[PDB]
Amino acid sequence: ALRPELAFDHDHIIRCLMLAAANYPRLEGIIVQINTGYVASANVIRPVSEKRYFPENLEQNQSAARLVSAVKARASEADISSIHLAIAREVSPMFNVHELKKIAESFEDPSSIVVVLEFILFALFFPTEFNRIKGDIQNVLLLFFSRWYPVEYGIFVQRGATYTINAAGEFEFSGRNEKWDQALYLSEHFPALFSDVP
Amino acid sequence: NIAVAHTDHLSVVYATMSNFMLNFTNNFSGNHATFKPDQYVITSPEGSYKPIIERQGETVDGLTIIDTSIVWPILCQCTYPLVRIMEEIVYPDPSTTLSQSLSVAQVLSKLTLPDAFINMILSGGDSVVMRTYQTEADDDLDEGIRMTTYDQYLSHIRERLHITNVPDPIYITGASTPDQIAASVQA
Amino acid sequence: PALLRDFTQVNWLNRDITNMLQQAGTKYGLGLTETRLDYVRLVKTIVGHALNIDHFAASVLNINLRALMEANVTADDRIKALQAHSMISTQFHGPNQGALRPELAFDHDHIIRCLMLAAANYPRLEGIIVQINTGYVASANVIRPVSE
Amino acid sequence: ISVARSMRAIVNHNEVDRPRGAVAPSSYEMDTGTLSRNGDLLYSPVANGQVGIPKLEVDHISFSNVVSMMTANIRTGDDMAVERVNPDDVRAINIRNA
């Protein structure tokens, strides 16, 4: 059944989206908003009022206090907007490279494992957004390893904190310990923690 | 407790959203070890270089920085339609997100049009300035040896040759036979 | 006077100025002459204008700017000073303004000299420094007087 | 006495081409020259294949110069925002290791 209108011009539209992506900073947000609204319309997730951060008794437990402070330091309050955004940006195109909201953490206390879990969950719930911020995550994880697993750490970092991939497809580790920066996300380099090379 | 809400409901919202009109990029291959985003620039022989993806750091938009802490409320203070005991699932009308995708597209084409238009003009379009020195007496102005500056060739001829998948044209030294030039031209 | 050309109604002057300006050895210009964009932001940073100004002032001004630019010290380097005045292992994050916010490197040599000299001329300098330290200890809330 | 005198008698004479004692400005006042990579000002080269004479090398005065300057994009001396993050526990701080 004929619709008396012009055909959707795939080619022209993609070219213009590229041009806008290269020239119009607001573009990212625009697309994200669409996605956000969609999540909001799907009614998939809402913030309940009561928190369930801790097992029964543990919050009032006096020997749990450092742990409870750690979790509470990590656990931000639920908001529909930040959450819908977190879901939506998994699908939304990225034009400005994302950065991790930096965490200072020495990893002395066992409770510091919370931060590690915070990443793992983020890598499960949001593999894409994770893959974007993951070298910046490696900077934190390297502290975690050097503190918790010093000898494995020395070995790993002796192999190199980053690697590249030759035309053959084999990984080539730097052999050098160096802090990752998102300047690198657009480069040939990968953070080495995620190589999954034994 | 919440895992069913994720796998058996939210997954579909992702699968739909990935098919949305303006979600045009390939964000992630599922392999952290190997994946890199495809990288593009709008680029001109005249010297423009506008990367599509670039690292400018924190912006006014508030999208660039990621608080990962968001995972906590998602685990420990969100309800879902699947958890719990029955709540009707919502299947959103396609028309709203579709029509806003479309209105965004037209808003963009309208927005980039003035730049696309002025630049079409500033480029000088699909033609080149060309001198024609005459090799003989009783030569018409049209007749002679056609020649153009390398800058014109770069702006206008070269990318087209690149795009047509043909070998780059031969240089002509003082020892160039007409047959070589012929082979080059036919190439 | 180069601007006078073909505007001065004085004939010989316009002839002489035209003659000088037509020599190979001299060329008037009223800049902008040289843009320099940033390597990341791709926006202009340091432009060179051909101002009408005596070459002495131009030289001093260019020396000043040369110093500021060639130091390769951004505002981010200030973090290093802050760390010195912070409790050990304070962390300092962001915002990575980069090349767009240059500053001069802290001048170790001149400061240590001026301090030695001051300490020689003004022994009471001791009491200034101590006072700074005192305030810090007081701010650190490490110890308090008590009635008990 | 007239050591400061760049110009003189900017007037036409009716009988003659230039008034006697009329003085034109020196060419040096009008050579904008260039800014060298060092940041020193230079006069234009007298000829091809020659570098320009530095303006500070000779005794002539020059009134067109290339002053480098910063645009609105570069800014210096502004105060800078930062997120300080204090140590989690004072007792865990390491004063010592080299």
Binding site: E77 | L63, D67 | - | -
Partner: peptide
């Protein structure tokens, strides 16, 4: 506490 996608500055360094 609250979620904040942004650098959460508090100090200002003088030049």
């Amino acid at each position: 506490k609250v979620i904040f996608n942004g650098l959460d500055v508090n100090t200002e360094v003088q030049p």
